[PDB]
């Protein structure tokens, strides 16, 4: 059934996110040492070592991934057929899903560049 697909996409970001860092769990975001004045500002996603993450890093990554895929699901399931409201609902659907697609890929590109320092 399609509920099995629901189960799998549920499992998707669940084991993209943090099952690897369930036992190696590293707490969410604080690592600044006063930087000049202000003591313990929580920093970010980890950047210097590549393999590590925190809980807050992983969840964000997983969320970015499944929304993109299910945006393509929405492109398939409704935008290619022609049955519903042919000027109001459809245009919304392609609009927000194209927004999903473009801004999602853009921000994930940003969230690999800034933790990664890769030449873009």
């Amino acid at each position: 059934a399609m509920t099995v697909y629901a189960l799998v996409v549920v499992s998707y970001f669940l084991i993209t996110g943090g099952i690897i860092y369930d036992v190696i769990v590293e707490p969410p975001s604080v690592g600044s040492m006063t930087d000049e004045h202000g003591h313990q500002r929580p920093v970010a996603f980890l950047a210097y070592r590549v393999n590590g993450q925190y809980i807050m890093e992983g969840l964000a990554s997983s969320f970015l991934f499944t929304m993109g895929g299910l945006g393509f699901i929405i492109l398939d399931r409704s935008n290619a057929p022609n049955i519903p409201k042919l000027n109001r609902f459809l245009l919304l659907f392609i609009g927000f899903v194209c927004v999903l697609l473009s801004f999602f890929m853009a921000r994930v590109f940003m969230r690999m560049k800034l933790p990664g320092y890769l030449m873009g």
Binding site: D35, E36, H37
Partner: peptide, 29 residues
């Protein structure tokens, strides 16, 4: 809302908050 600027107006307000929040935090660390 004959016009959509009221929304855009709200977005401008958030940006003013958004940008002006980190804008003073620029000189700090």
């Amino acid at each position: 809302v004959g016009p959509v600027p009221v929304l855009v107006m709200s977005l401008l307000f958030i940006a003013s908050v958004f940008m002006l929040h980190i804008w003073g935090k620029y000189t700090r660390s």
